[PDB]
């Protein structure tokens, strides 16, 4: 099945391939900003309303772009960006990944890095990294305490490195394969969750009192199911992360709330190179993506035979992700950024 929708493309320039995208949801107050993470950097649009009368669906305005010299893979907003009118400055604070296998905080005001911290070398992942997220830490005195950045990769470690009151602390924990994914769980920065490669979840509460089992809790694909039976991603479901969601490579996926088994399972109809992306909203519903086809399925948990297919284009798809309204997808081509409203979920 199909849905009704619209969508605007914007060619990036013809020297530009973009790897990742992401809204800045962490942060309501820039909530519409959208990061490309390209080639030389990152170049930062802004949605908003159409001008033209009778279009209730954004528009995309470039605004600038932030030179790295390098490719940018993966990319996450905090919780601290914001926006000043009085020349209007953003203030921007980014977590991402680039191509010399670095893990960064880049702090900003609007092109320009006016801060930079770099994670490689020998203290930082000894492979490629394969996700990244980033978590602002405030204490019983309500400041900002510390900005934590965790990182996973192909070296079989989960890094967590906190920017204190105090400076640095960095800490590496052991994975039984790589690295996929990682994410903070949402309202409860002291806990994240990990994929690795083999379909072990790992939940970590990484501020308890280094060991070989540092972990709360471990789930695993492997007996309920480089692309082989798992993993693509996993994901933290609902407000409070009440739930969890994990993705294989082969369109596999599980989903737990928070008889040991998961509470429901399905297969996408296409594989999933890229992973769940879970709506901002609804937590029964994820999109999921045929990358190399460029499809995109909708998926409700709850509903199977709910063959829904919103997004066909006949091209690669490197990226996507929801915008915090959840009507709006933006998604990434190999030469395009596409802005699609999903009439259904309108809103």
Same mark, same amino acid.
């Not at 429901?264 to 994820?286: E, K, N, T, W």
């Not at 035979?305 to 997808?329: A, E, Y």
């Given at each position: 099945?199909?849905?009704?929708? !619209?969508?605007?493309?914007?060619?990036?320039?013809?020297?530009? &391939?973009?790897?990742?995208?992401? *809204?800045?949801?962490?942060?309501?107050?820039? !909530?519409?900003?959208?990061?490309?993470?390209?080639?030389?950097?990152?170049?930062?649009?802004? +949605?908003?309303?159409?001008?033209?009368?009778?279009?209730?669906?954004?528009?995309?305005?470039?605004?600038?772009?932030?030179?790295?010299?390098? /490719?940018?893979?993966?990319?996450?907003?905090?919780?601290?960006? %914001?926006? !000043?009118?009085?020349?209007?400055?953003?203030?921007?604070?980014?977590?991402?990944?680039?191509?010399?296998?670095?893990?960064?905080?880049?702090?900003?005001?609007?092109?320009?890095?006016?801060?930079?911290?770099?994670?490689?070398?020998?203290?930082?992942?000894?492979?490629?990294?394969?996700?990244?997220?980033?978590?602002?830490?405030?204490? @019983?005195?309500?400041?900002?305490?510390?900005?934590?950045?965790?990182?996973?990769?192909?070296?079989?470690?989960?890094?967590? *490195?906190?920017?204190?009151?105090?400076?640095?602390?960095?800490?590496?924990? =052991?994975?039984? !394969? /790589?690295?996929? %994914?990682?994410?903070?769980? =949402?309202?409860?920065?002291?806990?994240?969750?990990?994929?690795?490669?083999?379909?072990?979840?790992?939940?970590?509460?990484?501020?308890?009192?280094?060991?070989?089992?540092?972990?709360?809790?471990?789930?695993?694909?492997? /007996?309920?199911?480089?692309? +082989?039976?798992?993993? @693509?991603?996993?994901?933290?479901?609902?407000?409070?992360?009440?739930?969890?969601?994990?993705?294989?490579?082969?369109? +596999?996926?599980?989903? *737990?709330?928070?008889?040991?088994?998961?509470?429901?399972?399905?297969?996408?109809?296409?594989?999933?190179?890229?992973?769940?992306?879970?709506? /901002?909203?609804?937590?029964?519903?994820? @999109?999921? $993506?045929?990358?190399?086809?460029?499809?995109?399925?909708?998926?409700?948990?709850?509903?199977?035979?709910?063959?829904?297919?919103?997004?066909?284009?006949?091209? =690669?798809?490197?990226?996507?992700?929801?915008?915090?309204?959840? %009507?709006?997808? $933006?998604? @990434?081509?190999?030469?395009?950024?596409?802005?699609? &409203?999903?009439?259904?979920?309108?809103?």
């Amino acid at each position: 099945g199909s849905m009704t929708l !619209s969508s605007n493309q914007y060619q990036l320039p013809l020297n530009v &391939r973009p790897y990742t995208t992401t *809204w800045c949801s962490q942060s309501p107050s820039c !909530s519409n900003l959208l990061a490309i993470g390209h080639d030389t950097g990152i170049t930062i649009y802004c +949605a908003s309303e159409e001008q033209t009368p009778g279009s209730t669906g954004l528009t995309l305005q470039e605004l600038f772009t932030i030179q790295t010299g390098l /490719p940018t893979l993966h990319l996450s907003f905090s919780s601290s960006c %914001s926006y !000043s009118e009085n020349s209007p400055v953003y203030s921007l604070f980014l977590a991402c990944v680039c191509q010399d296998n670095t893990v960064r905080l880049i702090i900003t005001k609007n092109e320009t890095i006016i801060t930079q911290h770099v994670l490689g070398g020998k203290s930082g992942h000894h492979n490629f990294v394969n996700d990244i997220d980033i978590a602002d830490v405030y204490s @019983a005195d309500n400041r900002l305490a510390e900005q934590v950045i965790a990182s996973v990769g192909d070296d079989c470690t989960l890094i967590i *490195w906190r920017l204190t009151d105090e400076g640095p602390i960095l800490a590496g924990y =052991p994975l039984s !394969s /790589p690295g996929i %994914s990682v994410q903070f769980r =949402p309202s409860n920065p002291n806990q994240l969750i990990v994929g690795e490669r083999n379909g072990n979840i790992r939940i970590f509460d990484w501020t308890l009192n280094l060991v070989k089992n540092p972990w709360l809790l471990t789930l695993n694909t492997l /007996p309920l199911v480089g692309i +082989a039976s798992s993993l @693509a991603n996993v994901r933290w479901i609902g407000s409070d992360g009440s739930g969890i969601l994990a993705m294989c490579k082969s369109g +596999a996926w599980l989903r *737990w709330n928070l008889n040991l088994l998961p509470n429901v399972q399905g297969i996408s109809l296409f594989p999933s190179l890229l992973g769940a992306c879970p709506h /901002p909203r609804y937590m029964d519903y994820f @999109a999921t $993506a045929h990358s190399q086809h460029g499809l995109i399925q909708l998926i409700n948990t709850y509903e199977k035979d709910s063959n829904s297919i919103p997004i066909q284009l006949g091209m =690669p798809i490197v990226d996507f992700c929801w915008h915090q309204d959840g %009507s709006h997808l $933006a998604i @990434a081509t190999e030469g395009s950024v596409l802005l699609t &409203r999903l009439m259904g979920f309108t809103r």
